[PDB]
Structure 1
Amino acid sequence: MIEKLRNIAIIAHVDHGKTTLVDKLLQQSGTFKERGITILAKNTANDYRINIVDTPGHADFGGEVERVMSMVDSVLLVVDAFDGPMPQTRFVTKKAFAYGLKPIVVINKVDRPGARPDWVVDQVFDLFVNLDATDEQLDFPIVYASALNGLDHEDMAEDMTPLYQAIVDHVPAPDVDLDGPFQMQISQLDYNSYVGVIGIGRIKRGKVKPNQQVTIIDSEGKTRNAKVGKVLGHLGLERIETDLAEAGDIVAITELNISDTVCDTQNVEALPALSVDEPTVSMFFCVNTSPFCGKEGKFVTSRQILDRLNKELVHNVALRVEETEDADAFRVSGRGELHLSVLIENMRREGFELAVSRPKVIFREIDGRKQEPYENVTLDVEEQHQGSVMQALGERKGDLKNMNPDGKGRVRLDYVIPSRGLIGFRSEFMTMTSGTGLLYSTFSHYDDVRPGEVGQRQNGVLISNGQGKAVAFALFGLQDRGKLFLGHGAEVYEGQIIGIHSRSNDLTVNCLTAVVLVPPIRMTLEQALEFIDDDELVEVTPTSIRIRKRHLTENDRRRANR
């Protein structure tokens, strides 16, 4: 059972000719476009299973495939005999060397009259070498292939059985331990409207029963298990129990994640592996409980938000979601802020109403000291805006690297700064430069702490105390103590922010009780996200953005004290 299994992954390009093979290969199945993940070719002339996971030619985002070939121990790279190798395979293959197994080349479309076998074999070598190995040698691989089912190999018997061999000879079964505690890391992931969350992966240690307690790793939660199932033909069928080394799937746990892990409960722990897919930012997703409880849009009862969040986790790799104590709340994490602000803005137009907390970083503990994540920052501002921007960032732990003046009168700057400290300067490096704040930046890596808090705002806010439209009567008078997000006539409610206060402390005012008034500010989504403190939320609807305190009345604000 253990030495039988052969875990591999297919790769093909615009020459749509994958299976094709598998389809015809099915010379076993139930003897008596398109999918999937995966397909068994359990065959003989031993009854060896052969799990075959499709590696997508379409590059998803944040690198899906890293996870795919972490399962398998070898690969199948199909190529056209007339065309030759192609650029869409370069992304996959270049990632199948460093990690990393024996490959198997498959020269298809030989049955074509327009075809070039000797030339393609030679064309492979030169583009295949540039990717090191550094073996091959064999690299065998170097088969014929005919979907339609001569010269070179063989030729030519049952253009099928010969291949079988190719896999079983050169691809080995995974070095994994049958016995001991159960252990598995979840490589792939998917979802269904009723069924819930789904697993998929190889099996590192032990075995699994349908009803069998387990524990989640990276954090602590240890929810139960219910139903389990494996793979046969183009289908996923149920199973009572199975051992090891099997690309078999699973349901009824948690939320669960890509690069997550879950083993037994005794004599185990833990599971590492990042590899470079870990998230860096956390924020909450809780349902809108404010005075527009399902007014402006359509989707509200936390049931469906979960679905909407889950369904993204199928083809969004760089994303993690987590369950909470209070069930109308979910912590959603990702590769960045604009990786999370995309999710939010997409849901607005679909017609959602909900609220999200402020982005705190993921200080992922890397070896002794509690490391946090940093970004390589690029600025292009005018020379008069340098002395300001140097000051504003030198206060957020702004270590400068290589400023480079560019003749013009315009100057370039290259900072590196902690993610935690880079929350807020997206508003200010625009407010300073006055439109000409050419700036966006990339993630670098995990570095030490600042340390201590650094990305905190000064100011308080001008808070309301009732429902109604803002008036000349109030707004022209309130706006002397700092600025405004709103203007003449706008339905507000108790617990909202209409604007900024000129000092650090906050205020509760009434807006209902020579104007001539100052327009308001354009606070967009991500600007609202970066803005809020550790006691404020961002109310988002399909129509406009409004910001609120977590507690509505002035006295409910005074309640928060421990």
Structure 2
Amino acid sequence: MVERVTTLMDKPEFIRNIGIVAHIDHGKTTLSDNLLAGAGMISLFMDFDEEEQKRGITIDSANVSMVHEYEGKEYLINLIDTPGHVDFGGDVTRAMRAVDGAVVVVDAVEGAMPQTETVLRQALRENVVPILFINKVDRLIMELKLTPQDMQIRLGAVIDKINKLIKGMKPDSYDGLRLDAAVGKVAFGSALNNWAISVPFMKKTGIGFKEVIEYCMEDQQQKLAERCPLHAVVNDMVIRFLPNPVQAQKERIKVIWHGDKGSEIGKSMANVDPNGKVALMITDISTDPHAGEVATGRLFSGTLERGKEVYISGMPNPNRIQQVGLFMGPERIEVDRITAGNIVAVTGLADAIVGSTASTDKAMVPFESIRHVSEPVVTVAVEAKHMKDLPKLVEVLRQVAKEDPTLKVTINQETGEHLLAGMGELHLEIVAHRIQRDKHVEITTSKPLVVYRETVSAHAGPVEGKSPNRHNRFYIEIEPLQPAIFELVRNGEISMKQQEVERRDILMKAGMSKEEAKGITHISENNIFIDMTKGIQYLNETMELVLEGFEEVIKGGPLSREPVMGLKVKLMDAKLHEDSINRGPAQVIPASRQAIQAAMLMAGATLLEPFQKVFIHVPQEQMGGAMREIQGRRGAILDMKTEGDTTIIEAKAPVAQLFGFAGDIRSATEGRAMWSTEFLGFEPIPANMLAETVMGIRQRKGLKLEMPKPSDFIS
């Protein structure tokens, strides 16, 4: 529907910008593909990457446009199919920035799962409107053999669960967001077998759930697909209940744009005004063989045209648009111009990165950053196979990191090697593949290792740090953050920019003494610095330097130069030299670093390692094989439930223990165990493993091969 798409994209009221989101494997891509087939867009089309087809997983968000007719008018559905695996969660985040509505897909059998909540929360954070498609209802009918009422109960429990999540996330918006099957905001069906129903649709066609069960039970789901077409029921739901750009954009900018809402551009964004100045939110960078580098984004105001110039936020020179169009899976349909309200593919924006604001005016308030979180937990060292390829590798790693901001690329100064840090083993496997196959650089990679965290287990101090000229002294106590306070900081509930009586009240109503709440001076990662001193001359002008020493230590702790978390650092006393020449950065910053590092080692310094939480659905026949695999990897079982022939195992294990788990769990269960994973958190390494783990880390970093001591820091 090439000419259809183009005619429709000019009319913002008939557009739906949507994303398909779900727990891994609940059926996003089958849904998206069969929506496209039913709609006559195609005869898995969206998993068009080779590794996606090879591994049977969505790795990258894919974009496609779809024409659907509803009550005598055609609508343009700009759809994003997103990945389910936690390692690719940043693809979901970037996609939620670009869409206005979301089809939350949930497997009827497993029901809502941990990444179901994750994707729902990411949608609501962006003021994206959710509807619900309960998929795999064929399995629920054919494998559990439940009566209609049992199946009404099961489906209704899923709806209720999604609604509790919504109500917990957006309590004041709950009424308008609540999912109601009788209203039509929920459908149920089988993406695989091209059929779907909803309460209003069943009334309309005169078909009950008992007839639906018969269709499946008598091996006639093809007939059901004709009577109850998947694409009709779901696309209708999309048109009816997901919002157009005209309703939505004013809601999106409440949370993605902190500029003057009554400005010229705030109005033209709020009105989807094609004649306004360009306002284009860049959500993705990727490379194609013909278009070259391509920026994906959401156009809120203006019109994009080949040859038009836009400014990129933070960059001085104006970028020129070379081509504009829409993605159709692996293809990108080119068009003369695209108007506000659409999800666009643009070439020629050399300076754009994920999160960029493209605008006509250089002085436009930039859109809010695309939030990240989830710091890397797995790392690999990477090197060019042939030394003639070193500068290509430099340029290629820059490009890989630009296209995937969840990857962190640093350089080992003690080996000249590049380190790739990402979300998991699979994440790094794909990256190494996308450097060789796609970027044409032969590389060698080390085995994946985890990134640890350093912390303390007890209180210590006051410890005296002394400047190299011996003229300045700082007295530091250190101890663990209480869990309530750690959570406030990790969730961003407090801040030094925040108001001082407000922050003091949040901290104190969390357990912190008034002394320490009012003394809090700095936050850095999941650590705080408190000033407990009164009336020390020159400490005000010197405190900025003390905090720099604190920040440096947080970046890499004294045990193994791993990042530090969970620390409460307190300045109890200080002595500074009268003359500023004796108390500048070269004097104060080392004194601060050394006091803090010595206190840490005196406070039961130890390592935390990342843990994954693992969910396994396995038939009873293979339960024993599943159990042996997780228990053999020193994982702890957390709970176990039975639901018919299936055992549901909830377990945790160190990330470091779960490398190669996919292939081993398949072998031990003959491929019959479904499993998924999520980051749990950093937990203490075994107490009898601290010396060996620290030595292991220091050796592979090039650091000195000896256990650090507080005598290394304070003379």
Cα distance change, pair 426–275 in 1 and its aligned pair in 2 (3 A): closer
Measure, in 2, the Cα distance between the counterparts of 1:349 and 1:443: 42
Between 1:19-28 and 1:43-52, the stretch displaced more is 19-28
Between 1:270-279 and 1:93-102, the stretch displaced more is 270-279
Cα distance change, pair 397–37 in 1 and its aligned pair in 2 (3 A): farther
As a proportion of its length, which structure holds more helix?
Answer: 2
Tell me which of 255, 269, 272 is aligned to 2:367. 272
CA deviation after TM superposition for structure 1 residue 94, in Å: 2.3
CA deviation after TM superposition for structure 1 residue 164, in Å: 2.1
In the other structure, the counterpart of 1:6 is 16
1:209-264 deviation line (CA, Å, top 9, x unaligned): 11222211134232333222213366322222211211121122224211111212
In the other structure, the counterpart of 2:186 is 142
Cα distance change, pair 279–94 in 1 and its aligned pair in 2 (3 A): closer
Pairing 1:96–2:123 present:
yes
CA deviation after TM superposition for structure 1 residue 313, in Å: 2.8
In the other structure, the counterpart of 1:440 is 564
Cα distance change, pair 457–246 in 1 and its aligned pair in 2 (3 A): same
Tell me which of 463, 477, 490 is aligned to 1:387. 463
Measure, in 2, the Cα distance between the counterparts of 1:275 and 1:171: 22
Tell me which of 94, 114, 128 is aligned to 1:67. 94
Q: Is the 8 A contact 2:384 2:390 kept in 1?
A: no
CA deviation after TM superposition for structure 1 residue 40, in Å: 1.5
Cα distance change, pair 235–454 in 1 and its aligned pair in 2 (3 A): farther
Pairing 1:40–2:65 present:
yes
Pairing 1:114–2:140 present:
no
Cα distance change, pair 320–161 in 1 and its aligned pair in 2 (3 A): same
Secondary structure at the counterpart of residue 129 of structure 1: helix
Q: How does 1:244-263 map to 2 (within 5 A)?
A: 244-263=340-359
In the other structure, the counterpart of 1:76 is 103
Measure, in 2, the Cα distance between the counterparts of 1:253 and 1:350: 29
In the other structure, the counterpart of 1:311 is 400
Cα distance change, pair 527–400 in 1 and its aligned pair in 2 (3 A): same
Q: Is the 8 A contact 2:384 2:393 kept in 1?
A: no
Measure, in 1, the Cα distance between the counterparts of 2:277 and 2:198: 49
Measure, in 2, the Cα distance between the counterparts of 1:216 and 1:123: 44
In the other structure, the counterpart of 1:22 is 32
Cα distance change, pair 213–106 in 1 and its aligned pair in 2 (3 A): same
Measure, in 1, the Cα distance between the counterparts of 2:97 and 2:402: 19
CA deviation after TM superposition for structure 1 residue 8, in Å: 1.0
Cα distance change, pair 123–222 in 1 and its aligned pair in 2 (3 A): same
Q: How many residues align?
A: 392
Q: Is the 8 A contact 1:380 1:439 kept in 2?
A: no
Measure, in 1, the Cα distance between the counterparts of 2:555 and 2:21: 45
Q: Is the 8 A contact 1:182 1:207 kept in 2?
A: yes
Tell me the amino acid that sits aligned with residue 106 of structure 1: F
Cα distance change, pair 107–395 in 1 and its aligned pair in 2 (3 A): farther
Tell me the amino acid that sits aligned with residue 143 of structure 2: G
1:397-440 deviation line (CA, Å, top 9, x unaligned): 998686699xxxxxxx965398843465489963xxxx699972
Pairing 1:158–2:257 present:
no
1:101-131 deviation line (CA, Å, top 9, x unaligned): 3211112233342353431222331353044
CA deviation after TM superposition for structure 1 residue 306, in Å: 1.6
Secondary structure at the counterpart of residue 130 of structure 2: strand
Measure, in 2, the Cα distance between the counterparts of 1:99 and 1:396: 48
What TM-score do the two structures reach when normalised by structure 2? 0.46
Q: How does 1:322-471 map to 2 (within 5 A)?
A: 350=443, 378-379=455-456, 387-388=463-464, 415-416=528-529, 420-422=548-550, 425=553, 430=558, 440-441=564-565
1:320-343 deviation line (CA, Å, top 9, x unaligned): 99xxxxxxxxxx9x99xxxxxxx9
Q: Structure 1 unaligned segments of length 5 or more: list them.
A: 281-293, 322-331, 336-342, 353-375, 406-412, 445-450, 459-521, 529-562
Q: How does 1:83-232 map to 2 (within 5 A)?
A: 83-111=110-138, 112-114=141-143, 116-132=151-167, 133=170, 134-135=174-175, 136-139=177-180, 140-147=184-191, 148-149=193-194, 153=199, 154-155=201-202, 156=207, 157-159=227-229, 160-174=231-245, 175=249, 176-192=272-288, 195-232=291-328
Secondary structure at the counterpart of residue 95 of structure 1: helix
Tell me the amino acid that sits aligned with residue 171 of structure 1: L
1:282-331 deviation line (CA, Å, top 9, x unaligned): xxxxxxxxxxxx9996155644422222123333337699xxxxxxxxxx
Measure, in 2, the Cα distance between the counterparts of 1:19 and 1:436: 43
As a proportion of its length, which structure holds more strand?
Answer: 2
Q: Is the 8 A contact 1:396 1:455 kept in 2?
A: no
Q: Is the 8 A contact 1:420 1:454 kept in 2?
A: no
Q: Is the 8 A contact 2:14 2:244 kept in 1?
A: yes
Tell me the amino acid that sits aligned with residue 232 of structure 1: M
Cα distance change, pair 398–126 in 1 and its aligned pair in 2 (3 A): farther
Tell me the amino acid that sits aligned with residue 421 of structure 1: G
1:175-231 deviation line (CA, Å, top 9, x unaligned): 322222112121122224675432101101111111222211134232333222213
Cα distance change, pair 101–308 in 1 and its aligned pair in 2 (3 A): closer
Q: Is the 8 A contact 2:465 2:475 kept in 1?
A: no
Tell me the amino acid that sits aligned with residue 24 of structure 1: N
Cα distance change, pair 436–105 in 1 and its aligned pair in 2 (3 A): closer
Between 1:155-164 and 1:44-53, the stretch displaced more is 155-164
Cα distance change, pair 2–62 in 1 and its aligned pair in 2 (3 A): closer
In the other structure, the counterpart of 2:678 is none
Measure, in 1, the Cα distance between the counterparts of 2:88 and 2:237: 33
Between 1:248-257 and 1:227-236, the stretch displaced more is 227-236
Secondary structure at the counterpart of residue 20 of structure 2: strand
CA deviation after TM superposition for structure 1 residue 351, in Å: 6.2
Measure, in 1, the Cα distance between the counterparts of 2:365 and 2:475: 37
Q: Is the 8 A contact 1:401 1:414 kept in 2?
A: no
Cα distance change, pair 265–123 in 1 and its aligned pair in 2 (3 A): closer
Q: Percent identity?
A: 21
Cα distance change, pair 379–109 in 1 and its aligned pair in 2 (3 A): closer
Q: Is the 8 A contact 2:466 2:473 kept in 1?
A: no
Secondary structure at the counterpart of residue 177 of structure 1: coil
Cα distance change, pair 30–166 in 1 and its aligned pair in 2 (3 A): closer
1:364-412 deviation line (CA, Å, top 9, x unaligned): xxxxxxxxxxxx99445896x86256989x989998686699xxxxxxx
1:342-378 deviation line (CA, Å, top 9, x unaligned): x99x9999469xxxxxxxxxxxxxxxxxxxxxxx994
Tell me the amino acid that sits aligned with residue 6 of structure 1: R
Q: Structure 2 unaligned segments of length 5 or more: list them.
A: 1-10, 49-60, 145-150, 208-226, 250-271, 376-382, 411-418, 423-430, 436-440, 446-452, 483-525, 531-545, 569-582, 591-697, 705-715
Measure, in 1, the Cα distance between the counterparts of 2:129 and 2:555: 51
In the other structure, the counterpart of 2:380 is none
Measure, in 2, the Cα distance between the counterparts of 1:386 and 1:278: 34
